[PDB]
Amino acid sequence: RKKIFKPEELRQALMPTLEALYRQDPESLPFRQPVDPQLLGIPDYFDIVKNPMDLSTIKRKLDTGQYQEPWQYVDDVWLMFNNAWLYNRKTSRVYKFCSKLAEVFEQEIDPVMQSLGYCCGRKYEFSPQTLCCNVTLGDDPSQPQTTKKKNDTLDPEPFVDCKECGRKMHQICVLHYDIIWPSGFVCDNCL
């Protein structure tokens, strides 16, 4: 039946991934506390970032059992990075630091999500998809909200739920070209 994750299971699996981020010096420094626009002198910050996130807040969420399942933790991690890549310029120190944190995260999260029964821990598709030649802006919980182009955006890798345990798994990870699931997808664990 439906998998429920208890707080201590999520904390013990995931916290090392967050620690790996905190370990980065200088890179984690701008991410260790909530952005304070007065202190930092950036009064436009909450004009651009509608839903702030930082390492301390994620830590507090883990410590207090605020995540019901681990994709929610992954989403906050990417909300944090996506906010910073939005607010800050590509040539800025804080943007480059953010890209380093994301690299570290990508390398840490997969075996840890695998230990929790998931296919992997990866949020985004690997490449932009080929194209054919206001309010709360919610496409995705990690996408910073909004109130001529380059085709370099990544979409979230789409999910299918296991009908037995209720875990969200990637379509591209668990659905294969030569297998059909007439009665709905069941993950290998639950099989």
């Binding site: 002198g41 950036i42 009064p43 607010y87 800050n88 310029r89 120190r93």
Partner: peptide, 6 residues
Amino acid sequence: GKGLGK
């Protein structure tokens, strides 16, 4: 578009 930076 982009913020005043930090």
